Design a protein around this ligand. Structure first.
Ligand SMILES: [Ca+2]
Length: 615
DNA sequence: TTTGAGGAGTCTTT
DNA sequence: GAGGCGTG
DNA sequence: AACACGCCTAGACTCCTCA
């Protein structure tokens, strides 16, 4: 059915969301109408529309429209879309600000020239503010401007906002089940599909699992609209931060903070609050909380720490939203109090509560403890005996470090140019480990996914699979993912722990063969260079090691997926292996990194920090 | 008025 | 978040 | 030497802007 990828991927999105009664409740007749209208277009019409949907939202010169793969002459196609009410022509081009925007710098010249009142030179931005002030006061001459501006611009089209808004809202619904497609893409700006989805959705093959919904996420179409608002807000803030527009970003955040304070009482929330965590993250309240968290990053960037500390205390005062984020919060609270506000009394309480919170883990739990030792073992603190108070003396077991060198040129070395980690590999190759992978945490991740695939994608857990295109159970990064599969996991873990170096070889082979290619977030099909490499490796690691790593990734992927060693190296014959974090001249171990190395050692694995010093 | 660097916008695959 | 790499 | 920030994140290609 020869459809081009962008259209195929678009169509997968509409289908996947429309086949949900739950989700279709969230659209009015008028809205659904527009969807049908899409389906009523020719393929040519639809191809163009997707293209235009994927461009930036604003007018386009007819000259800057070319898709010979769509049509050698597009006027009919445009006409179609225009009758359909999907696109608008220069004829509806009425705003002036807009017409000027569409005109180039040299075209703003020819208009600043054929209009004596204008100063004929300046930046594109300059001439615009000008042309707008003149049309504002003496209104009649501003119409003659618009006329020639329009004639100068040429024939132009724009996507209609109303139809666009609908597809965007479908996209939003699609992208939730898919984390968010990307943490900015089907968030906003004015939302389209992620590059990865746009290009690949139409070709992707997803794991089989049984859809099974017993729970509404959104009350009504209103509720979704709210959620979509906040989403586009959170996107906007994020875009500011990313460009350096920190002040703008602040206005946005406060604007958002008050918006959220209006909704505080709204009935929809009582229900949201009631949803399981793996679903609650798809509500207004959660998005706003995420905004607030960005707010505190902006407050810190503008060195306004008393205020960051207020927002941080405020977040940490409620357990309904983002409980996983508490680690980051407590940690960040403590760092602000200790290092930016020098208030040590509150810095101690901070830490104390932080460590009592079962929702703080790994990295941020270690960081808080490590600040706690720094304090009660410091001259400028000896005025207290209130951190000698029962500290679970969490002594992360010490690890074998090592130092190699390389000639400096992300850090480039020479040997042909290479990375830091690639230079460490070459060391270990000549240290008798012929085999090695620079895979960081995905090496272990795909192994876990290989060994537990069928339990990952097990049936019998309501709401964790809500539609066709998932690549993980929605509860995957949650405390509950283990809880809800306890008996199966427990048994699978036990079983791997005891499996000889050939049952594992065969388990992996079984999944690889049944699942190869299937999109699943844990697994990277090219992470190993062939099935037999994965086999070679699982053989070296053996049962208890493998079993332990999987145990953590399943108990707490949310807080464990990060910090595994850059490298796994092994001797083909001796079957001996080492887990190696490569640290360049300019870095030391993150907290997560050290917790892991401790943990790997407890499972009886050779672990090693390899430092590189330049020459 | 010429030249050049950096920006913005678009596209990718079945 | 994730994690490296560079400055203060 | 210990601790913090800051910045970034795909890649290629084209046409546009502004100095
Ligand atoms: Ca490293």
């Amino acid at each position: 059915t020869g459809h081009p990828y962008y259209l195929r991927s678009f169509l997968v999105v509409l289908k996947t969301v429309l086949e949900n009664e739950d989700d279709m409740l969230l659209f009015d007749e008028q809205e659904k109408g527009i969807v049908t209208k899409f389906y009523q277009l020719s393929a040519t019409g639809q191809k163009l529309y997707v293209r235009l949907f994927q461009r930036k939202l604003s007018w386009i010169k007819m000259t800057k429209l070319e898709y010979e793969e769509i049509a050698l002459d597009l006027t009919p196609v445009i006409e179609e879309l225009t009758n359909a009410g999907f696109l608008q022509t220069e004829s509806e081009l009425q705003e002036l600000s807009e017409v000027l925007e569409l005109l180039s710098a040299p075209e703003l010249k020819s208009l600043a020239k054929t209009f004596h009142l204008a100063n004929p030179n300046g930046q594109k931005q300059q001439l615009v503010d000008a042309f707008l002030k003149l049309a504002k006061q003496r209104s009649v001459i501003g119409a003659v401007i618009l006329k020639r501006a329009k004639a100068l611009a040429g024939q132009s089209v724009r996507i209609c906002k109303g139809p666009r808004a609908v597809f965007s809202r479908i996209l939003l619904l699609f992208s939730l089940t898919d984390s968010m497609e990307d943490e900015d893409a089907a968030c906003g700006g004015q939302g389209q599909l992620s590059t990865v989805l746009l290009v690949n959705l139409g070709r992707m093959e997803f794991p089989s699992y049984t859809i099974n919904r017993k729970t509404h996420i959104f009350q009504d179409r209103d509720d979704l609209i709210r959620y979509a608002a906040a989403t586009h807000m959170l996107s906007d803030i994020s875009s500011a931060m990313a460009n350096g527009n920190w002040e703008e970003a602040k206005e946005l955040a406060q604007c958002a903070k008050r918006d959220w304070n209006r909704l505080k009482n709204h009935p929809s929330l009582r229900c949201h609050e009631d949803l399981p965590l793996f679903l609650r993250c798809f509500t207004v309240g959660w998005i706003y909380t995420r905004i607030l968290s960005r707010f505190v990053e902006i407050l810190q960037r503008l060195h306004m720490y008393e205020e960051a500390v207020r927002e941080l205390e405020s977040l940490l005062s409620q357990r309904i939203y983002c409980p996983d984020s508490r680690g980051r919060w407590w940690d960040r609270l403590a760092l602000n109090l200790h290092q930016h506000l020098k208030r040590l009394e509150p810095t101690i309480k901070c830490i104390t509560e932080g460590l009592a919170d079962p929702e703080v883990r790994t990295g941020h739990r270690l960081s808080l403890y490590q600040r706690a030792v720094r304090l009660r073992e410091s001259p400028s603190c000896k005025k207290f005996k209130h951190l000698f108070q029962q500290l679970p003396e969490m002594a992360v077991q010490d690890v074998k470090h090592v130092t190699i060198t390389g000639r400096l040129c992300k850090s480039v070395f020479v040997m042909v140019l290479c990375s830091v980690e690639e230079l460490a590999l070459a060391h270990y190759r000549r240290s008798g480990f012929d085999q090695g992978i620079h895979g960081e945490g995905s090496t272990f991740s795909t192994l876990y996914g290989l060994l537990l695939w069928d339990i990952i994608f097990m049936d019998g857990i309501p709401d964790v699979f809500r539609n066709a295109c998932q690549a993980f159970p929605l509860d995957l990064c949650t405390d509950s993912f283990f809880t809800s599969r306890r008996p199966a996991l427990e048994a699978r873990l036990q079983l791997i722990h005891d499996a000889p170096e050939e049952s594992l070889r065969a388990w992996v082979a079984a999944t690889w063969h049944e699942q190869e290619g299937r999109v699943a977030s844990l697994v990277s099909w090219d992470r190993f260079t062939s099935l037999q490499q994965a086999q070679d490796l699982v053989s070296c690691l053996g049962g208890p090691v493998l079993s332990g790593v999987c145990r953590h990734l399943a108990a707490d992927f949310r807080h464990c997926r990060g910090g595994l060693p850059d490298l796994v190296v092994w001797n083909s014959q001796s079957r001996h292996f080492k887990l190696v974090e490569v640290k360049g001249p300019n870095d030391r171990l993150s907290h997560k990194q050290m917790i892991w190395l401790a943990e790997l050692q407890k499972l009886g694995a050779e672990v090693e920090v390899c430092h590189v010093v330049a020459v």
